[PDB]
Amino acid sequence: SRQRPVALVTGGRRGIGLGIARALAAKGFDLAITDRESDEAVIHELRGLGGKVAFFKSDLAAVKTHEATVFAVLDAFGGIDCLVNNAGMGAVERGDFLALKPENFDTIMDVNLRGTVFFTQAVVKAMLAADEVRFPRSIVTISSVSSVMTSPERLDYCISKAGLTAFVQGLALRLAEARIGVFEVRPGIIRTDMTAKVAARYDALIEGGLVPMKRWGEASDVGAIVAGLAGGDFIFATGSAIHADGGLSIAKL
Amino acid sequence: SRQRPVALVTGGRRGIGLGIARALAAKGFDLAITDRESDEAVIHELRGLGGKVAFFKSDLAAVKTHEATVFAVLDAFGGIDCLVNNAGMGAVERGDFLALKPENFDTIMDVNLRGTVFFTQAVVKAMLAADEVRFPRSIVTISSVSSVMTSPERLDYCISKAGLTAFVQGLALRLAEARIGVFEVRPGIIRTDMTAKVAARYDALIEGGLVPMKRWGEASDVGAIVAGLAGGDFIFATGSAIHADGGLSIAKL
Amino acid sequence: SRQRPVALVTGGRRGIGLGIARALAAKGFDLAITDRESDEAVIHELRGLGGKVAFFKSDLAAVKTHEATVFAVLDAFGGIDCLVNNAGMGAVERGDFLALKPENFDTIMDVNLRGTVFFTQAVVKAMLAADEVRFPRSIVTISSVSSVMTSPERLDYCISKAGLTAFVQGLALRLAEARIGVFEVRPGIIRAARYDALIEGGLVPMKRWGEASDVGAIVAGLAGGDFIFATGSAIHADGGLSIAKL
Amino acid sequence: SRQRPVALVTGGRRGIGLGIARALAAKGFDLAITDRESDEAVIHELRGLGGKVAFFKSDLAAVKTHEATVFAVLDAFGGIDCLVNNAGMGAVERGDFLALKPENFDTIMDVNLRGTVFFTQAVVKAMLAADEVRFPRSIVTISSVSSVMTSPERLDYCISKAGLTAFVQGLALRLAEARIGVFEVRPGIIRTARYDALIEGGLVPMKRWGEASDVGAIVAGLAGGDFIFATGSAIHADGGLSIAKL
Ligand SMILES: [Cl-]
Ligand SMILES: [Cl-]
Ligand SMILES: [Cl-]
Ligand SMILES: [Cl-]
């Protein structure tokens, strides 16, 4: 029987996903990391936090492959205690809604919304079949402030994320008797790899107070929030949405 | 040069769409009705209200065909003043989220969400190219209370309608300078064709106070609301969402 | 028996309230206008729209006086079909929350929230006692975009308006069986050179001032009966200001 | 120069407040407890968790006394790192809105809304004047699911809590630059007769009573600093009760 809880972090080898994986490992979780390709240096780095880490190749959009991925995780770890739905993408192209291509809408919906929904389904079947439950359990979905704030130049992104908000509410109800805490986390403007030109612009916007807290969010901010929710103290808060955005999404006049 | 405003009502041959069509005709609109299935009898009947009525055979999900449908509507009427996005479907199968099939999710998302988005895009291209704007203009999207209330046995439906909520907010911003009023109407429990068994069960629930107003919604309720929004008096309320549910979606304890 | 529906518009002789009164009169309503002081010129202008108009002196904050006001309206008109809760005030002082004075918080809560709640109570007692219901009935409460958008320099105003939002939801449930449509209307930037530039610069997506007539047309739509099954709905009369955008 | 952070928990002597105080002391906070009524036995027992505990007699509604209470807390502890606005009351009478008394509306608004706003103002003045910031800082306001779910038989309660929701949003903006995390926690049906049957019948999706320790665990999580970038968030501590379901 497992002695550490197991977190499956989709898209966990870079960016926000990696910040989440690091926070969870530090809190005492073992880690199943998925992505289209691995990074062995990152897996090694995560093992340095003192737990077990394994990588599983998965395309989130390829829903026919999800059950096999879940079985691989089960075969390696025995069970799943926390799912973090982090994998996602931005819009393929930004621009006028009038120029939005159905093909690009499809690509993002298939990843962010359809893929996440069915990956979650596959994991939940396994969680509901677990013959023992020794750790707090959770499903934490990383959507976006774009779930609730609209950006007309990228409505495909916004719609895909708003879909997740609705999904999470239903999922919370479905899993309430099983005592699996179901949460949404909405990141705002989180630091990414950037050119000086772009970073200087964002920094001026942030310092100007676009973000009330007047700083970049870090992957570690999202990570600490997620690890907080995964530790079990928020079980009775199932269905809650947390905005990891420095106050960006506060409606202000 | 048209002397009456033109409303394009998708799915306008039956049910809520027909109620909306009747109400708009009574207010003085000409009507362009789309549906996948022909119904000349209903078109004939609508002509009794004194306006022009024309039918356009269209499958909402067939996005590659939308430009041609819009071109046909322009050829018949010269312009479009009001779009009512009413066409849609319920979930193919209701039941446990764990049994939800990707193919059924895709069917409903392709109709309710993808189809509506790209049909709207085709219409909006036409509207923004109009060389005369003599009438109030609007886009009224008929979503559902399921946009904001979850039903775990049909999350595909809820997700599709929540997506529309997000879309409507962005669309309202896109069209604000063009003075096209953009609204969401969320129907609740509206009378449909039903067996005595099912109708009796719903009547008991409605009378018990599931619906605070303790009556069925009628297609004419949704029609009267839409015709009010389409008349121009709500232009400055662009981005508003109207329940049409007898209070069903009021959150109460 | 009355042959025209009766609308009671609080704060109805100036500004948004007067736009609402004008729209309702043009739609065929008789008008009971309240305010702290009359303007007989305005009352005369409203009579030009072809109905009955009467003024009733009332301080919205003086809740002990509300029943008498409602009786006066009933004595004049026989019944009330539409209440428009328009009367209100802005914050006494704007500035840092750290400097907010309890007495100023009290002034605005007593008017916008407490006064409205108990005036509504008085009117509703009368509506539920009516022996005839020949017209569509409604209660339309004019709150603000500040019900849902926060302004830290005037949190007393924001809190007062958010309170009304909660009140309207409850009221809608209370009155649903009686088929009294209950609605919230949230005005944005309604009609200066400073505001012009901000509006032109796109703070308001529609890029224009709201007019009292915008709010009036919306209210008159709701009061006409076609929105009865949409009870509990909120409409924002703000040119898109309150759409959450990034 | 303090070596442990300080949490001021209003109404901390019993119920949810005591569950919050316990969770915070277990996480390493010193405690300033307020209540209108003393209970030295409870204070004594809290010291068993190993931190400093002090009591300050305070009536949340008595806003003229708040600066003195905060001065006393500063005299004892040197600063305040976490404020938990827990103190509050239910409606004096539950019943038809038509029977709601202004006197009762005033009592609850004075405690839950006005008292909380101005007690927070006093604490925030102290926080913003601090010469040292060695610990994560937060203001966690305990409202209710009634902030967003209406109950027509107690609209005074609902309105008071909705007013807090709006307050928290503005407060979060005001304090964001200062990196004080500002949060709302909305308790559902917490164990403090009909209800036990309703919970069984599925009203609460998780099908159990909430405990004061549920709310306490949530608050201690928020107070620990890891949620600083989530300022403005609302957490519903209700077993899924407020999820809008059809
Ligand atoms: Cl994007
Ligand atoms: Cl369905
Ligand atoms: Cl103001
Ligand atoms: Cl209560």
Å between B110 CA and nearest CA of chain C? 26
Gap between the Cα atoms of C121 and C128, Å rounded? 11
Structural contact between residues C142 and C161, judged by C-beta atoms closer than 8 angstroms? no
Gap between the Cα atoms of C219 and C185, Å rounded? 8
Q: Which of B98, B109, B125 sits opposite A98 (nearest CB)?
A: B125
Q: Which residues of A touch B121 (CB under 8 A)?
A: 97-98, 100
Interface of chain C toward chain A, CB-CB under 8 angstroms = 145-146, 148-152, 241-246
Question: Do the Cβ atoms of C206 and B179 come within 8 Å?
Answer: yes
Residue B68 host element (H or E): helix B66-77
Question: Do the Cβ atoms of D162 and C166 come within 8 Å?
Answer: yes
**SS3 of B232, please?**
coil
DSSP state of A205: H
Q: Which residues surround ligand 4, an ion (CB under 5 A)?
A: D 90-91, 154, 157
Q: Residues B198, B200, B204, B206: is their CA dihedral positive or negative?
A: positive
Q: Cα-flanking dihedrals φ and ψ of residue D177, to 5°?
A: -65, -35
Structural contact between residues D66 and D93, judged by C-beta atoms closer than 8 angstroms? no
At the topology level of CATH, where does D1-246 sit? Answer: Rossmann fold (3.40.50)
Q: Which residues of A touch C195 (CB under 8 A)?
A: none
With CA atoms as reference, the chain B residue closest to A110 would be B106
Alpha carbon of B158 to ligand 2 centroid (Å): 8
Question: Do the Cβ atoms of B170 and A163 come within 8 Å?
Answer: no
Å between A247 CA and nearest CA of chain D? 6
Residues 6+ apart with CB under 8 A from A123: A8, A70, A80, A83, A139
Question: Do the Cβ atoms of C229 and B246 come within 8 Å?
Answer: yes
Burial of B197 (0-12, 13-18, 19+ CB in 10 A): exposed
Token pair, residue A204, equals 């001026």
Nearest to residue B154, comparing CAs of B189, B109, B121? B109
Token pair, residue D207, equals 């099908």
Region for B8 from its dihedrals, namely left if φ exceeds 0, alpha if ψ lies in -120 to 50, beta otherwise: beta
Q: Which amino acid is it at D186?
A: R
Alpha carbon of A90 to ligand 1 centroid (Å): 4
Alpha carbon of A91 to ligand 1 centroid (Å): 4
Gap between the Cα atoms of D194 and D197, Å rounded? 6
Q: What is the 3-state secondary structure (H, E, C) of chain C?
A: CCCCCEEEEECCCCHHHHHHHHHHHHHCCEEEEEECCCCHHHHHHHHCCCCCEEEEECCCCCHHHHHHHHHHHHHHHCCCCEEEECCCCCCCCCCCHHHCCHHHHHHHHHHHHHHHHHHHHHHHHHHHCCCCCCCCEEEEEECCHHHCCECHHHHHHHHHHHHHHHHHHHHHHHHCCCCEEEEEEEECCECCHHHHHHHHCCCCCCCCCECHHHHHHHHHHHHCCCCHHHCCCEEEECCCCCCCEC
Q: Cα-flanking dihedrals φ and ψ of residue C132, to 5°?
A: -140, 140
What number of C-beta contacts closer than 8 Å exist between A and C? Answer: 31
Token pair, residue A253, equals 């006049």
Question: Do the Cβ atoms of B155 and A167 come within 8 Å?
Answer: yes
Q: How many angstroms separate the Cα of D39 from the Cα of each of B251, D11, D22, D36, D57?
A: 38, 11, 15, 10, 10
Gap between the Cα atoms of A63 and A82, Å rounded? 20
Alpha carbon of C111 to ligand 3 centroid (Å): 13
Gap between the Cα atoms of D71 and D32, Å rounded? 12
Q: Could you tell me how many helices (H) and strands (E) chain A has, helices first?
A: 8, 7
CATH of domain A1-253: 3.40.50.720
Token pair, residue B232, equals 């121009």
Alpha carbon of D94 to ligand 4 centroid (Å): 7
Give the count of beta carbons closer than 10 Å to the beta carbon of residue C151. 17
Gap between the Cα atoms of B45 and C182, Å rounded? 35
Å between B8 CA and nearest CA of chain A? 19
Q: Which amino acid is it at C107?
A: T
Gap between the Cα atoms of D76 and D53, Å rounded? 10
Place of tokens 């310092």: A207
Question: Do the Cβ atoms of D150 and B248 come within 8 Å?
Answer: no
Residue A222 C-alpha from the chain's centroid: 9
Q: Between vectors from CA A236 to CA A249 and to CA D144, what angle results, nearest 5°?
A: 60
Å between C73 CA and nearest CA of chain A? 38
What number of C-beta contacts closer than 8 Å exist between B and C? Answer: 113
